[PDB]
Amino acid sequence: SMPNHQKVVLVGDGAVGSSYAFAMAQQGIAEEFVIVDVVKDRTKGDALDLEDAQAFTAPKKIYSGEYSDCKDADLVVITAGAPQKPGESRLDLVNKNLNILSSIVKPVVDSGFDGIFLVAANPVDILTYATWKFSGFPKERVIGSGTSLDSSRLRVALGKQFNVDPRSVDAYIMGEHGDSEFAAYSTATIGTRPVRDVAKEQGVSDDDLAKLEDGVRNKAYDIINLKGATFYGIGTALMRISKAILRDENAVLPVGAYMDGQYGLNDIYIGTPAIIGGTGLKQIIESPLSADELKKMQDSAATLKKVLNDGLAELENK
Amino acid sequence: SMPNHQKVVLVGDGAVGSSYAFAMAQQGIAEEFVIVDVVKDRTKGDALDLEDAQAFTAPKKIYSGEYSDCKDADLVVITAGALVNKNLNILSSIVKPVVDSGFDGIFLVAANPVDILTYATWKFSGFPKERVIGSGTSLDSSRLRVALGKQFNVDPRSVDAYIMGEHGDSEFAAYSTATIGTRPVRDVAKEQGVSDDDLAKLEDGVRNKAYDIINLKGATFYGIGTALMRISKAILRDENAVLPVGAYMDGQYGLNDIYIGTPAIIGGTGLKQIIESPLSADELKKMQDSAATLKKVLNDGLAELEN
Amino acid sequence: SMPNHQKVVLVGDGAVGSSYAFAMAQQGIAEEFVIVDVVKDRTKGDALDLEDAQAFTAPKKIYSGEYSDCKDADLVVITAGALVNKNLNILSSIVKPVVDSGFDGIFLVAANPVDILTYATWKFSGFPKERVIGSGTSLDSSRLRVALGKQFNVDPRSVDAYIMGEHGDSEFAAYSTATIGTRPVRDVAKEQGVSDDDLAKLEDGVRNKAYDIINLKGATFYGIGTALMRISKAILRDENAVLPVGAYMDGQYGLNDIYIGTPAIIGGTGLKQIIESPLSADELKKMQDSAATLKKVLNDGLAELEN
Amino acid sequence: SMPNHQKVVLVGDGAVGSSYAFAMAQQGIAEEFVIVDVVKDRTKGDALDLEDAQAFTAPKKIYSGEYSDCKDADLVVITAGAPQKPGESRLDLVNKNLNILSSIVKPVVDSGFDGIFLVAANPVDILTYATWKFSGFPKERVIGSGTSLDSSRLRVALGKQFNVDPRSVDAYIMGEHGDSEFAAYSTATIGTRPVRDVAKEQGVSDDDLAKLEDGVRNKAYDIINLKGATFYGIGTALMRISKAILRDENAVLPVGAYMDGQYGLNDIYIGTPAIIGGTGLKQIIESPLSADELKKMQDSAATLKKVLNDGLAELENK
Numbered sequence A, D: 001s002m003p004n005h006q007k008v009v010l011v012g013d014g015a016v017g018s019s020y021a022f023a024m025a026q027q028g029i030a031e032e033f034v035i036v037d038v039v040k041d042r043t044k045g046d047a048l049d050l051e052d053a054q055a056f057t058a059p060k061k062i063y064s065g066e067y068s069d070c071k072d073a074d075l076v077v078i079t080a081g082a083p084q085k086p087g088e089s090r091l092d093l094v095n096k097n098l099n100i101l102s103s104i105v106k107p108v109v110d111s112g113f114d115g116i117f118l119v120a121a122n123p124v125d126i127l128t129y130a131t132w133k134f135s136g137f138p139k140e141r142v143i144g145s146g147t148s149l150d151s152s153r154l155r156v157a158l159g160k161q162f163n164v165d166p167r168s169v170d171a172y173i174m175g176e177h178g179d180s181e182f183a184a185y186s187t188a189t190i191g192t193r194p195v196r197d198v199a200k201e202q203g204v205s206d207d208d209l210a211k212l213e214d215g216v217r218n219k220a221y222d223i224i225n226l227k228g229a230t231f232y233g234i235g236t237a238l239m240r241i242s243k244a245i246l247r248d249e250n251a252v253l254p255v256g257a258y259m260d261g262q263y264g265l266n267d268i269y270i271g272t273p274a275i276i277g278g279t280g281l282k283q284i285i286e287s288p289l290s291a292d293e294l295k296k297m298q299d300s301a302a303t304l305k306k307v308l309n310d311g312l313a314e315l316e317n318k
Numbered sequence B, C: 001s002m003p004n005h006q007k008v009v010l011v012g013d014g015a016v017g018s019s020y021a022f023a024m025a026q027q028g029i030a031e032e033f034v035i036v037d038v039v040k041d042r043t044k045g046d047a048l049d050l051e052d053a054q055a056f057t058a059p060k061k062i063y064s065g066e067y068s069d070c071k072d073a074d075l076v077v078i079t080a081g082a083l084v085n086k087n088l089n090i091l092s093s094i095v096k097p098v099v100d101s102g103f104d105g106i107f108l109v110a111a112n113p114v115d116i117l118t119y120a121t122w123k124f125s126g127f128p129k130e131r132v133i134g135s136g137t138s139l140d141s142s143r144l145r146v147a148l149g150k151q152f153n154v155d156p157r158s159v160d161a162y163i164m165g166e167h168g169d170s171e172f173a174a175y176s177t178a179t180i181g182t183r184p185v186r187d188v189a190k191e192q193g194v195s196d197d198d199l200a201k202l203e204d205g206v207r208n209k210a211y212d213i214i215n216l217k218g219a220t221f222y223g224i225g226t227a228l229m230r231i232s233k234a235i236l237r238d239e240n241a242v243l244p245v246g247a248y249m250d251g252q253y254g255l256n257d258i259y260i261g262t263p264a265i266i267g268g269t270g271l272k273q274i275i276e277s278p279l280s281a282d283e284l285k286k287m288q289d290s291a292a293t294l295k296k297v298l299n300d301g302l303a304e305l306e307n
């Protein structure tokens, strides 16, 4: 933006977007943080509340804005989206969120913005592909949160089972982010040893690992049943991806990336290990999944593909 | 708690307590964080949500508990409550089982009205004054720092300024003891065309900020979640850091036998010592007037409590 | 330099420059760090040693380079040297190729004597005053903070105190503008049985600390490696933080056309503004006397190399 | 030590011990740091220099002490040693350092100290075993730096080769810490993909990987040739292990641990993945080495054990 001064624009100030902003304030990442949402007064109240964290953390210019403020932004994070109502279908979550997204991306690009998009709005793989499509940006400049949140929940759960720090569990959730997703246990390790071997060694059966994987898959549902909403894990994950970009780290993170052959997939965004740096996605790393895990991945992707395309077809049914 | 392992118990899992817990997770302060509230499902759900921050911050054992879990805690932070009477009532239901668990660390009190409830936590717990610390004017001092920082294009952390008085409407900016780069804020203000009226409006903004945030988005919690993390850090990393907290007056400012906001040095054993800001005669009058209603309300609530 | 990628060039890889680089690696500040010095085999070896810190701190591209690597650097830190005439000579060999590389970021000057070499870096580079910052009295102000902190059982970061004057023997503790928790250090001292004589001895300790560390272990570098990392942080994270630095006097303290230590606001464009500490009449006399000598030696050295 | 106040005693204030203390000061780990060395005025001058870092980092009580200051310490870090001279034999390096060590450990234990030992003095696996033996402490309360420095140099090297952050390279140097040591490539990964596959994929041959491993093995030697001494990497590694202990992390780190069957080894300390926490070593994790790599490891260990017992035998020859 101006010398030694990085600028992030948040589009979508709900609990996700807001706990992301607070995590970015606790971490001292970026020097200017713009909050954009249709509920303008909300964004003015949250900027005032957030900016009070500065006396004890690090200075940051936080304020309520508009899409034109994206002009010289380095990163635009899209968390804006509607929740799935009771009785509502999955394709209708897609439908309304594609609509909301198409209202966001065009003015963001028309502001002159040419930094990176980070997309976290659900369903995230569909909406990341659609952000790429609507913006016309290079694939590497559009990154989705993919399976970063669920991979963290798998790390927390394996960490808890095996009395290890979650950051020392090298494990990924693969597939499209919900119910068809699975723990990629075949490529998962703790201290370079396979999680299944650590498991067997310690009396943890493959059934126990299956229940653990189920816990991870149901965790969003359980947190929403207990307290109404879930946002701390993805606010943190979005801060970690923003950090890899803004501190040019070339760090390996679970993100959503454009498939160009990897895993036998094409023209979809889906969750992968990938190297993230200051220009965006540097490269995709294909986790060497077992034959069973790769079938799961391709199945999950096949149906994601179908829903991505119905959604987009309906968006052009004018 | 167990070797090289610090334990914090949060009593009160509303938006203040919860954003405090999140700030503690982003900062890697303490190794075990227990969430206690009456509404158990909420705390169970928040521990699960909070613990997912660990894969990208630092490991922490976060879970939903009960008052008995305070037994070997180092710090109990009370953010619970809904007014003086209903909050004294809620507080008396919290402190007695926390002390009966065998807890003997430090209380950090942030439930409103904070000065009254901090003194009542001291009175109900029977702890030493230095082991009961209130948030006092830490939040509004931060808001003053942010506002002066914005006015003068300075980092809020370089604004040495305090809000004094009892935490609401009778409170004031102690401008006579406030500085930026050791220069008095009123002189910086003059030098830059900012009048004493402008400083009075700025002080008004600070005093009204909670009200304005609640009008715009319904609730205000990020500033005090952060302030509570900063005081917790000074305690758990034994820093002897100078912070705005609520402390027991023993003669300072001409006050006795109330908790109120002061500069104080905070460390591993709790409050190390109070530092009396050398207020102008006008500012000291405001402080003593503000303090004078406090003593009446506090004592009305404590006597009410026992009938 | 390239997207979301800051670049620092260190000129001078002795113990100061090297411990600065290590502090920048522990802190994760800047993404690329180039080490430039006359002895290339030392800079090569230090880049290899330093880069091993990355597996457990944060990634950084550290390598040995030349002045041409300053082309697109954001910050050039000059710690190189060997008195006034030999260091002015070494400096003039550094600045001209650094500027000819096309560099137009900020200079941070720590080479001794620092106030004289900071002014000469401004003069030889032709840069704006705000883009040439010296370390001024930042190290000795830190030593005063550590000593008052130790005397009064306070965290050094909560001691608001500056060493003023030209950085050695004529320098003094600006006690009249120094505070802990907004209370004057002399009042805290008097309240605690610390006499003005005791404060004078404390100030002597700070003034002699470099000499004493060199007598005990041969060299002193950790304090200035840290202070240089803090000023670099305020620049690269655009903080507008108030720090002790060396800045161009333009009337402040009754001084003109010398660089000397002041409180100042530091941000992403360099020095944002000088803050004149409101010194007592005695302290201002000391400052002006000290400055008067600096100013002679400066213009003598500069006239000598113009021959 | 006293409430919410951790205490570390450093024995050995040369360049390693001193850059460790500086790294601990920049990181705000521990509240009290005692510097002990036979050269007392050096520990006094370094405490003064070090404590000046506090105004801009975090408060720490740093001072020069004696072995009796270990009484209530949580951690004692032994970096004290004499360097190998030209013409001197490997067993004579072991010999003088065993002598120095026996002069350190007994007064440290007699002070009443019962925290954890972290041993970094060279040769580190031999001296870590001897610290265990001389102190009489549980194996889990005596931790050596093992291959942590060289594993970091391998991570930095693979990171540089593959344009990845070193912290995202899951790779270990195994064997006894010098010349017989090797890159455990078979259990090494980047984004869960095997380093050899990433290598093959990107045109980096097994020969190239062998040269890379040679660079790592020779890096200490090269740094000493260029600038006279090498200390920043092990000062940081020692701070990272101290952090895992003092912040009870159960983090997986390269350390030196007592072999009780692992890798087919017994009654030696050697480099392993292990989980480190507030009570010391929580558990050893056996990297599933290829048969070739395990042969290398066992040969390296066989010869370390030989030198170990030669040195301890000469220390008993009175």
Ligand SMILES: NC(=O)c1ccc[n+]([C@@H]2O[C@H](COP(=O)([O-])OP(=O)(O)OC[C@H]3O[C@@H](n4cnc5c(N)ncnc54)[C@H](O)[C@@H]3O)[C@@H](O)[C@H]2O)c1
Pocket: A011, A012, A013, A014, A015, A016, A017, A018, A037, A038, A039, A079, A080, A081, A082, A083, A100, A103, A104, A119, A120, A121, A122, A123, A124, A145, A146, A149, A150, A229, A230, A231, A234
């Ligand atoms: N990617 C992941 O893994 C992950 C996980 C959980 C949640 N999230 C997602 O983040 C998104 C937001 O969640 P939240 O907690 O912030 O929800 P929320 O319902 O509390 O807030 C959503 C925000 O979207 C805004 N919005 C809706 N329509 C708008 C429009 N047309 N233009 C601009 N803004 C508009 C609302 O005004 C609101 O502030 C969801 O789609 C959610 O499922 C991501």
Ligand SMILES: NC(=O)c1ccc[n+]([C@@H]2O[C@H](COP(=O)([O-])OP(=O)(O)OC[C@H]3O[C@@H](n4cnc5c(N)ncnc54)[C@H](O)[C@@H]3O)[C@@H](O)[C@H]2O)c1
Pocket: B011, B012, B013, B014, B015, B016, B017, B036, B037, B038, B039, B079, B080, B081, B082, B090, B091, B093, B094, B109, B110, B111, B112, B113, B114, B135, B136, B139, B167, B219, B220, B221, B224
């Ligand atoms: N000190 C300050 O400067 C500052 C500033 C703003 C808010 N806060 C205060 O902190 C407190 C909480 O604020 P909030 O916005 O999170 O409100 P809140 O009412 O949503 O949350 C507090 C929680 O305490 C719980 N609680 C009530 N009785 C309890 C009991 N007996 N035991 C355990 N838990 C119980 C409730 O279930 C409630 O949700 C309030 O009193 C508020 O005014 C402090």
Ligand SMILES: NC(=O)c1ccc[n+]([C@@H]2O[C@H](COP(=O)([O-])OP(=O)(O)OC[C@H]3O[C@@H](n4cnc5c(N)ncnc54)[C@H](O)[C@@H]3O)[C@@H](O)[C@H]2O)c1
Pocket: C011, C012, C013, C014, C015, C016, C017, C036, C037, C038, C039, C079, C080, C081, C082, C090, C093, C094, C109, C110, C111, C112, C113, C114, C135, C136, C139, C219, C220, C221, C224
């Ligand atoms: N400003 C302060 O408050 C402060 C305090 C202490 C030390 N320092 C100063 O920083 C400087 C370095 O101190 P040190 O302890 O590292 O001592 P040192 O003598 O080892 O370092 C000076 C460095 O400058 C190098 N050098 C000389 N000519 C050079 C050239 N033309 N190009 C590049 N490099 C060149 C030397 O080789 C050496 O590495 C000194 O002048 C010292 O007094 C600053």
Ligand SMILES: NC(=O)c1ccc[n+]([C@@H]2O[C@H](COP(=O)([O-])OP(=O)(O)OC[C@H]3O[C@@H](n4cnc5c(N)ncnc54)[C@H](O)[C@@H]3O)[C@@H](O)[C@H]2O)c1
Pocket: D011, D012, D013, D014, D015, D016, D017, D037, D038, D039, D079, D080, D081, D082, D083, D100, D103, D104, D120, D121, D122, D123, D124, D145, D146, D149, D150, D229, D230, D231, D234
């Ligand atoms: N573990 C690793 O991977 C690794 C890597 C590099 C260096 N190091 C090691 O750290 C140690 C020190 O390295 P350095 O560069 O700091 O060395 P140095 O030679 O600069 O200093 C060694 C210190 O040991 C002290 N010492 C010697 N005899 C003593 C005694 N009897 N009691 C107490 N102290 C005494 C000396 O006085 C000296 O200050 C060495 O053994 C070195 O091999 C470890």
